[PDB]
Symmetry: C2
Subunit: 1011 residues, 2 copies
C-alpha cells in the first residue's frame, strides 16, 4: 500500500486535533504559564539518513540506525544540509502533473532518535507524541513497530505510544517523504523544502483526560457586560465525582469562576452529551482586546474531584473581542476596522522554514514599529507560538488553510472533484479546531488561489457553522463567489480595469459599486513590493481612507525568501531561484518583501510606514488639525514636535503634547512663525514622538510625520560683475575654456563635455552625455525571460525600439564668447535603424564667476515607448566619503513613491546611497533635489539624482549583488525627469499614466560650480 | 490494518461514481436500450463459505475454494440461508456502542466465483467490475491478488481488473464482513441483513472513455423553449480528432443534435477543462415530464472521430422538468405540487432485500392505482432500475443518502465530529453523482434522523452548489435548521402541540406561522400505518388541501418488513422481531406498511386512496361540482358514473363523461332524481371510471368516489297487532319466554340472556353480556413491554384501572308480562377493587311479532380511562358461509377512518370479515351499520359490528396470526359506540378527543329478530 499516492488516506491512527496542550498538574503553574514537566521537548540531536527512494531504505534501519548515517539537529530541513537541492517555483509544479501519483524517484529522509522514558509515565495514563510539522508525508515506527502515517505538513500530527513505549531505551524511526498526494495541495509560492521543520514533543496525560475546550465570548451593544461560554470535553471513564472549574484571572486577581458537574443540556430527542459540560462566566466591565490595547485574560480549566483533588489543569489566553459584519462593514467591538496588514512567510534567515521565538518577536517588533496592525498567515497554518505572540503584542491574524492548487489545468480541477474533499476537509477542520481559541485570529481563510469548487464553499460555511464568531474569506473564483464574506482580490488596482475572461479583476472602487454587491472589500494581496517597487501606495491608502467599505489590505509580502550560498572563499551571499541547480524556477520571484532576509528594512518600508499612520494632519492657515485613526485608545503616549526650516536651516521648533480621542479631532495653534527676508523656502515639519517605551517600541519612537510648504521668498538679487572673463580657444577638434585654475574641454567630434580640470586634476573619466535609459527594474522586466519574450513589458518595448542601442549623432556644435561668458551650443539626435527617437539641444553657459549653466531641451517621439529617464550621465574621477544633498530624503524615493521622504539637508555616507537589492537595478534615486554636493563639486537646480560606485550598464548585466564590483571613480546620473516605478503587480505594466514620461518636450536647467 | 474499524478509510483503489454505464458500440443499440454485449451479468451460482470471524478464514481460500463450502445464488443474503440469524432493531444498535470499533466476533461471508473472459477484452481497453451493493464492507481478490476494499452498502463499488484479469479461467474472491465502521451510519429501521444483496457485473470500456455525463435543462417562464446543457467528461488520451454528438430523440424522431470538439470555456485565470466539452441543444415546444404525463426523451451521447467512426456511445432518459422554490412554494413546471408520497423500503417478499424488476413494477402499479404520485427512497439510495421505472411510470422520487446515527448519545455525536466527515461525504457525493440524471429524482436528502451537525448542512449545500436544479431537505435537528429548504417533520400532528425539549414537533398549521419561517412544509414521515392504524388521515388531507404551503407528505410506510418462517409441518408463516433468536429487538415494529409482505392490500390502503383523489366533488342542490387536482393533464380518460340508492336498492343510474381542465371546475346537472314514498334513506354515489387501460391501470379502474345523503322518508307506520302474546314463566333461577317455535332464556343469577331456542337448536354458546374492552391495537400498546411499562399507553391505563379484570355484579333483574309483550329489566355494575367503573341498565322487550328489542343505557366514570368500546358480546352457535350487512363498507372501517367506506348493501364471505393482521388485535369492525344478517338472525338499529371465528380474548393472548385457532361457533361483538384508533404515531396516544368515548352517559337500541 502506497499511502502517499492515495488521496483517500490522509492519516492512520492519528489523534484528533485540539487547542494546544501542556498537561499541568497544578493550577498555579497553569495560571502563569510555567513550563510543565509532563511536556517534554524532543528537539535536539537526531540521526539522519538520506535515500533516493523509499524502496531503497533497508529494513535493518527499523532495528538500529545505519553506521553511515549522519547526525543533524531537529527541527531542520535536510535541503540546507546538502542532501538535496531546494526547488522554488511560483506556479508550475516541481514534479510531473499526474495526480495523485508522485514520481518514483522520491527523496526520502530517515530520522532516528534514541531516548529514555520515566517509568512513572508508563504505569498510568496515556503518552502521546506531537509532530508540529513534517514536510510532507511520514511513516512512524516505535521500537521497530509501525505506529501510524501522516500527510499534512503545517498542522500537528499526534500519535499514541502508550502500548508501544517500553521502560529504558526507546527508539523512534521516522521515514519522511518529499512528495506525496497531499503535495498537490501545497503549490504555495515558497522554496519547496522538506524535512521535520517544526518541533517534536512528548506529552503525558492521565487516564481520564480533558479532550478539548472551546472558549467563546458574548457581549451586548455597549460592551459593558460579557458572558464567557466554555465548552469542555473529556476522554476516558465517566464518573459522578469529576468536576470542572473554569477560572478567569486578570494578572493575579480572579475575575470570575464556575463549577459544574459533567453533563450537558438536552440537544436532541433522547438526551445530550454526558461527557461535555458548559460553564457560563459573567464578567462585569471587561477589558476589550484589540491591536492597540492587547488586553488579555488567563482562563484556567481544571478537571478535579468533588473533594478538590486536581487531576489535570489546562490554560489558555482569552481576549474579549467580537468580529462581525453588518451593513457591509467589518466591525471589531462595534468599530469599523482599517486593516494595515502584510503577508508573511515563515522564512528563517539561516534555517529556511525552521521558525524560532527570537525571529518571531523581531518580526512583530519591526511590523508594529512600521504601523502594521494585521498579519495574514499565508498560505498555511503557522507555528502555534506565533498566535500566542500575536495575542501578547496585539496583531490581527488571518488564519489560512494550507491549500493551493495553482498547478492544475484548470484551477478548480481538484477542488471541484469530490474525491479530494476528505483531504481538504482534514486540512481545514483540524486547523479550525486548533486555532479557534486565539483572539488574534479574527478571519478564517480556506487557502489561496485554488479556483472555485463546491468543496471550497462547503468548507467555508462549515467554518461558519462551527465558528460563527469569526468571518471567513476566500479568494479563488474571482473573489466574488459565495465562498467569502469579504471581497478579497489579488492586486486589484485602484482605478484601472483589467477584465480577464471569467475571472475579472475590477478596480476596487468600481467593484464595490457592482449591482447586488454588499460585502466589504479587504485586499488579501496588493502592492507587490518586489525589489524596487511599491509605487502608488499613496493612491491605495487614499482610496482606503476615503471609502468606508474599503477596509485596507495586506501587502505581499513581509520578508524576501532568499537562501544563503557560499563562494569559493566562503563569503556568504543571498541566492534566488535557479542558483541550486533546480529546473524549472521563477528566477528571483521569491524576493517580494519589505525587508531583507536578515530583516534589514527596504526603502519601501518607510513609505509603507508613512501611508499607514494612525494620525492625520491638515494645515489650515497657522493651525494644525490632528486626526486620530485609533479606534479604542486615547492619545496618552504621544506628543507633537513641530519645526520650521528655511532651506534646511532650522529657525523655530517646539513640543506640544497630544490629547486626541479615538477617531477624534484636535486643534494645535502654532506660535508666531518667523518671517525671513532671505531667499528660500519655508517647510513646516511635524512629528509624533512617543516619550515612553512600550512593549514594541523604544523611548523616542516616531509614529507619524507630515510636512508642508509655507510662504516663500523668491530670489531677485543679481550676481556681482566678475572681473575675469573666460578665455575661449578654438582648436581643429576641441573647444577649451580657461578661467585660470578652472578649465573646461568640449569634444567637437562627440559634441559633449570632454573633460574638466581643477589645477592639474582631471574630474571625469567618461564625457558628460545624455541618458534616456535606466537599469530595468523587477516590475519593469515582468515575467519575460530570454527564452520567452513578453512584448507588454517595458524593457522589451525599449530594447525592441532600440532605447538601449541608440547611438548619439552630432547635429550642431557651435561656440562663441560673450561679454561676461562663453556660450556653448550643441544639438544631438538618437537614431535606431533610421528612426530618430530623442533630440536634445543643450546650451552651456560658462560664467566668469565660475558657475557653468546647463539648459537641456529634449524632444521625445511618442510612437516609441515612453523613456524611463530624461537626464545626464557622467562618471566623476573622485571618490568622496560623504555626499551632501538638500531635498527629499534621506531614504530612496521615486516619482510615484515620495510621500515619505522629507525635504531637508541630509548628510550620508556614499555606501548608504546604494541600497543592496539582490537583483541589481535602478536604485538610490532621490527626488526633489535642489542642491547636491559631492567632493569639490556642487550642482543646483531641480533634478532627480542617484550616485553610486556602479555603472548602469553593470547593473543591467550583473544578476547577483555579490558579483557587482566597484568601478573606478564615481558614477552620477542627474535626471531632470524620471518615470515612476509602479508596483501594483510584477507581471503587467503597473506604471500609471501620470507618472509616465509622455509629454513630448522636456526642459530642465542645471548649475555646475565648485564650492 | 483493520480497515473496517477505521472511519478514515472508506475505499481502496475504487473508481469514481458516475451515472449508469452500458458501453454501447452502436448508437442505434444505445437509442432503444437494447442490451450491450460489453456489459456482462455475473449474477448466478456462486461458492459461499461462512466464518465466525475474519481471522478464522484460512489463507488457502485465496488460492482455491474450500471443499466444505456450499453453493448459493447471487444476489442473496446469507441470513436467509441459515448461516446466521437476522437482527431487527429500531433504535438501539445490534452491536456494542463503541465507535469506530466493531466486536471481534464478526460474521464473515466468503464468496467465490470462477468464470471465463474473452480474449478480446484483455487485448484493448479497460475492464471493470461493479458491485451494486454489498452489506457491509468487503475485500476483493482477483486470481489470488488483492484488488481493493469497499465500505458503502447501498452505492455501487467499482474496481479495475485490467492488470489483474488473465485469459482463461479466472477466480474472484470476496470476503464480506457483517459489521464495519460504516455500520455506525447504518442505523436505519430494517432487518439488519448482510451479504451481496445486489447485482454484480463486468463492464468493458475502450482505452479512451466517456468518463461522466451531466444533463441539465433550462426553461423560460412559459416552458415553450428549452435549452439542453450536456456536460461531457473523458478519461484517456487527448487527441484532436475526438468529437462528441449529443442527440435527442422522441420515439424514433430526432429532435435536436450537436457536435463539438473537445475543450471547454475558460473558467479560471489560465484556461479551462481540456477534457470536458459542452453541448447546448435547443428544443422547441418540449413535452414536459410529470407524474401525470411521464413524457421522456432519449439522449444518446457518443464519442467518435472526425471521420465518423464511433468509439463508444452512452445513453440516458431525459425528462424536461424543473423543480424550484419561490415564495415558500415548491413549484414543478410552474405549478404548486401536492405530494401524495409514501415511504418505501426494499423488502422482497421472499428474498429479504434482494430486489428484482417484477416486484418493482408490481409496487409501482399498486402505488399508482391507489393515488400515490411520489416515493421516498428511505433511508438509502435504491437499485438504479427503480429510478428508471419511476421515469417510465411517472413517480416523484426523493433520493436519500444512506446515513442514520440513531444509536449514539446524543444524536449529533458523529455528525458534528469532523473525523467522520469523509465517510458521509463519500456517502452523499457519490449518490449525487450517480442519480443526478434522473428526472424522477426531484428532491435530494441527506439521510434520516441523525441530529444536526455541521457536516450535515455542509453536505446539504454541497448538493446545492453542485446540483442547484433540485431542492434538498433534511430532518435532523428539529426540521427547522439551516440544512433544509423544505420543513419536514416526523409525525407532526395537525392541531395538537407536542413540545419536546430542544426538538419540538409543533403542529404543522402552527409551524408554518412561526416567526421568520418561510419554507414550505412536506412531511417526510406521517400517519404511522402500523397494523390497525391510519386514523385521522382525513384531517391531514383536509389540512393539506386547505393550506397552500402544506404540500402533502409521505406515509410511513409502504410494505411490512416481515420474514417467512416455517413450522414443524412446513407451512410458511410471517414472523417479526425476536422470532429468530435475536436480542435485542423491537417486537413487531417492522410491520408499518399499507400492504402485506406478499403485496396484499390492507384496509387502510383504501382510505389512503380515497383521501388522495385527484377529483373533488361538491353537491349543491341537484348539481355536482367536479374539481380536478391534476396540474398538467386534461380529463380525457375519465367518466362520471352516478347512482341513487334507497337503502341499498338501486333506483336510478347513468354515465356522464368528464371534461375538466387541470385545476379546473365543471358542473354536472343530474336528471330528475326519483322521489319515493317508501321509508328509507336516499344515498347518491358517484364514481370516476377510467374506460381505457393505461400503462398502470386496467380498463374500468376507479380513481375517485364520493357519496352524499339525499332526502329521507321517516317511517311512521305501525306494526300489526300480533294475535299471539309471549308466555312468561317464572322459575326459582330462570326466566323463560315462549312464543311457540321461539324460546328465550334469561339467567337470574347472572342477569344476562342465557340462551335462545329455534325449534330444538341452541343459538348461543356464551350468554349475551356487555363488552367495554377490545383487543389492544398496535397504536394502543405503544412502546410498552412486560419488562418496561409505559403508563401513558391506553392498554396500560385500562389494565391499571381493571377494565380487562372488572367483574359484572347483578343489581336488579325483574320480569313482567305486558299486554302484547314480555318486558325484562336488568341493571349491572362493573367493579374493580371496590371502584365502580361502568353501570348498564338494559330493557329487553319481547314482542308478539317475534322481534325482541334491546335498549342499553350505560353510565361510565371519567376518572377511569375512557373505554375503547360500549357494546354487546355474544358467541353464536351457528357458522354461516355468508354474512349480509347494510351500511358502510365493504372494507374495514373505524370511527376515525370511515371516509372511504360506502353505505350500501354488502354481501361477503365470513373469511373476508377477518383481516389477517400478523399481530392479532381488534379488526373487522364495520361502522354505520343499519341492518345485519347472519344465518337465521337479523339485527337492526344503529351500531358498529365485527364478526369472526376468534374471540377477543384469544386475540389478546395470541401474538402470531398463524397460532390463532378458529373457535366453535361464531363470535359477534355489536357496539353502540366505539373509540377511534388513532395513527399519528405508534409510541404516544394518538386518539383525538373527538373520537374518545368520554360523554359519560351512552344509549343505543337494538332489534333482534329471525328473518
Amino acid at each position: 500500500r502506497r499511502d502517499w499516492e492515495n488521496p483517500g488516506v490522509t492519516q492512520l491512527n492519528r489523534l484528533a486535533a485540539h487547542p494546544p496542550f501542556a498537561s499541568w498538574r497544578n493550577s498555579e503553574e497553569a495560571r502563569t504559564d510555567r513550563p510543565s514537566q509532563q511536556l517534554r521537548s524532543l528537539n535536539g540531536e537526531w540521526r539522519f539518513a538520506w535515500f533516493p527512494a523509499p524502496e531503497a531504505v533497508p529494513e535493518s534501519w527499523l532495528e538500529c540506525d545505519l553506521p553511515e548515517a549522519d547526525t543533524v539537529v531537529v527541527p531542520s530541513n535536510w535541503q540546507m544540509h546538502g542532501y538535496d537541492a531546494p526547488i522554488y517555483t511560483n506556479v508550475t509544479y516541481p514534479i510531473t502533473v499526474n495526480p495523485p501519483f508522485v514520481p518514483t524517484e522520491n527523496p526520502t529522509g530517515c530520522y532516528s532518535l534514541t531516548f529514555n522514558v520515566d517509568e512513572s509515565w508508563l504505569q498510568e495514563g496515556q503518552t502521546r507524541i506531537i509532530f508540529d510539522g513534517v514536510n510532507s508525508a511520514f511513516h512512524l515506527w516505535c521500537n521497530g513497530r509501525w505506529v501510524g502515517y501522516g500527510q499534512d505538513s503545517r498542522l500537528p500530527s499526534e500519535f499514541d505510544l502508550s502500548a508501544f513505549l517500553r521502560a529504558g531505551e526507546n527508539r523512534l524511526a521516522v521515514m519522511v517523504l518529499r512528495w506525496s498526494d497531499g503535495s498537490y495541495l501545497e503549490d504555495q509560492d515558497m522554496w519547496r523544502m522538506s524535512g521535520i521543520f517544526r518541533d517534536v514533543s512528548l506529552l503525558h496525560k492521565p487516564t481520564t483526560q480533558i479532550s478539548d475546550f472551546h472558549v467563546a465570548t458574548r457581549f451586548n451593544d455597549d460592551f459593558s457586560r460579557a458572558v464567557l461560554e466554555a465548552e469542555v470535553q473529556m476522554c476516558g471513564e465517566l464518573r459522578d465525582y469529576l468536576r470542572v472549574t473554569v477560572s478567569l484571572w486578570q494578572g493575579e486577581t480572579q475575575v470570575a469562576s464556575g463549577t459544574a458537574p459533567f453533563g450537558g443540556e438536552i440537544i436532541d430527542e433522547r438526551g445530550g452529551y454526558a461527557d461535555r459540560v458548559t460553564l457560563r462566566l459573567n464578567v462585569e466591565n471587561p477589558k476589550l482586546w484589540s491591536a492597540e490595547i492587547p488586553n488579555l485574560y488567563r482562563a484556567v480549566v481544571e478537571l478535579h474531584t468533588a473533594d478538590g483533588t486536581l487531576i489535570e489543569a489546562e490554560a489558555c489566553d482569552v481576549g474579549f473581542r467580537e468580529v462581525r459584519i453588518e451593513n457591509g462593514l467589518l466591525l471589531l467591538n462595534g468599530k469599523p476596522l482599517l486593516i494595515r496588514g502584510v503577508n508573511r512567510h515563515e522564512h528563517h534567515p539561516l534555517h529556511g522554514q525552521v521558525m524560532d521565538e527570537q525571529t518571531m518577536v523581531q518580526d512583530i517588533l519591526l511590523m508594529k514599529q512600521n504601523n502594521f496592525n494585521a498579519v495574514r498567515c499565508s498560505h498555511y497554518p503557522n507555528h502555534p507560538l506565533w498566535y500566542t505572540l500575536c495575542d501578547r503584542y496585539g496583531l490581527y491574524v488571518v488564519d489560512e488553510a494550507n491549500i493551493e492548487t495553482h498547478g492544475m489545468v484548470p484551477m478548480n480541477r481538484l477542488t471541484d472533484d469530490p474525491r479530494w474533499l476528505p483531504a481538504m476537509s482534514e486540512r481545514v477542520t483540524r486547523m479550525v479546531q486548533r486555532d479557534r481559541n486565539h483572539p488574534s485570529v479574527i478571519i478564517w481563510s480556506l487557502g489561496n488561489e485554488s479556483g472555485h469548487g463546491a468543496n471550497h464553499d462547503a468548507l467555508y460555511r462549515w467554518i461558519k457553522s462551527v465558528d460563527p464568531s469569526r468571518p471567513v474569506q476566500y479568494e479563488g473564483g474571482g473573489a466574488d463567489t459565495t465562498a467569502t464574506d469579504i471581497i478579497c482580490p489579488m492586486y486589484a488596482r485602484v482605478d484601472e480595469d483589467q477584465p480577464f475572461p471569467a475571472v475579472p479583476k475590477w478596480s476596487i472602487k468600481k467593484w464595490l459599486s457592482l449591482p447586488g454587491e454588499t460585502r466589504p472589500l479587504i485586499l488579501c494581496e496588493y502592492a507587490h513590493a518586489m525589489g524596487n517597487s511599491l509605487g502608488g501606495f499613496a493612491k491605495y491608502w487614499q482610496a482606503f481612507r476615503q471609502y468606508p467599505r474599503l477596509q485596507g489590505g495586506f501587502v505581499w509580502d513581509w520578508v524576501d525568501q532568499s537562501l544563503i550560498k557560499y563562494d569559493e572563499n566562503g563569503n556568504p551571499w543571498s541566492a534566488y531561484g535557479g542558483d541550486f541547480g533546480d529546473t524549472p524556477n521563477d528566477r528571483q520571484f521569491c524576493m517580494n518583501g519589505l525587508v531583507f532576509a536578515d530583516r534589514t528594512p527596504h526603502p519601501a518600508l518607510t513609505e509603507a510606514k508613512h501611508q499607514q499612520q494612525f494620525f492625520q494632519f491638515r494645515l489650515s492657515g497657522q493651525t494644525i488639525e490632528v486626526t486620530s485613526e485609533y479606534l479604542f485608545r486615547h492619545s496618552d503616549n504621544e506628543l507633537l514636535h513641530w519645526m520650521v526650516a528655511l532651506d534646511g536651516k532650522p529657525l523655530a521648533s517646539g513640543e506640544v503634547p497630544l490629547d486626541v480621542a479615538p477617531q477624534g479631532k484636535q486643534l494645535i495653534e502654532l506660535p508666531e512663525l518667523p518671517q525671513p527676508e532671505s531667499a528660500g523656502q519655508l517647510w513646516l515639519t511635524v512629528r509624533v514622538v512617543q516619550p515612553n517605551a512600550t512593549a514594541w517600541s523604544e523611548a523616542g519612537h516616531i509614529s507619524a510625520w507630515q510636512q508642508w510648504r509655507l510662504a516663500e521668498n523668491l530670489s531677485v538679487t543679481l550676481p556681482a560683475a566678475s572681473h575675469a572673463i573666460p578665455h575661449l580657444t578654438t582648436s581643429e577638434m576641441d573647444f577649451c575654456i580657461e578661467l585660470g585654475n578652472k578649465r573646461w574641454q568640449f569634444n567637437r567630434q562627440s559634441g559633449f563635455l570632454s573633460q574638466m580640470w581643477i589645477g592639474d586634476k582631471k574630474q571625469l573619466l567618461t564625457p558628460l552625455r545624455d541618458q534616456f535609459t535606466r537599469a530595468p527594474l523587477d516590475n519593469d522586466i515582468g515575467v519575460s525571460e530570454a527564452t520567452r519574450i513578453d512584448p507588454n513589458a517595458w524593457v522589451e518595448r525599449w530594447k525592441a525600439a532600440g532605447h538601449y542601442q541608440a547611438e548619439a549623432a552630432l547635429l550642431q556644435c557651435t561656440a562663441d564668447t560673450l561679454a561676461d561668458a562663453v556660450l556653448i551650443t550643441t544639438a544631438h539626435a538618437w537614431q535606431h535603424q533610421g528612426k530618430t527617437l530623442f533630440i536634445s539641444r543643450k546650451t552651456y553657459r560658462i560664467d566668469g564667476s565660475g558657475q557653468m549653466a546647463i539648459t537641456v531641451d529634449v524632444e521625445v517621439a511618442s510612437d516609441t515607448p515612453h523613456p524611463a529617464r530624461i537626464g545626464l550621465n557622467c562618471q566623476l574621477a573622485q571618490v568622496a566619503e560623504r555626499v551632501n544633498w538638500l531635498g527629499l530624503g534621506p531614504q530612496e524615493n521615486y516619482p510615484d513613491r515620495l510621500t515619505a521622504a522629507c525635504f531637508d539637508r541630509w548628510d550620508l555616507p556614499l555606501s548608504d546611497m546604494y541600497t543592496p537589492y539582490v537583483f541589481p537595478s535602478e536604485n538610490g534615486l532621490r527626488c526633489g533635489t535642489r542642491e547636491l554636493n559631492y567632493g569639490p563639486h556642487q550642482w543646483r537646480g531641480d533634478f532627480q539624482f542617484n550616485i553610486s560606485r556602479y555603472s548602469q550598464q553593470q547593473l543591467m548585466e550583473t544578476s547577483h549583488r555579490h558579483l557587482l564590483h566597484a568601478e573606478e571613480g564615481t558614477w552620477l546620473n542627474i535626471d531632470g525627469f524620471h518615470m515612476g516605478i509602479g508596483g501594483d503587480d510584477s507581471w503587467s505594466p503597473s506604471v500609471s499614466a501620470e507618472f509616465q514620461l509622455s509629454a513630448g518636450r522636456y526642459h530642465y536647467q542645471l548649475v555646475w560650480c565648485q564650492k
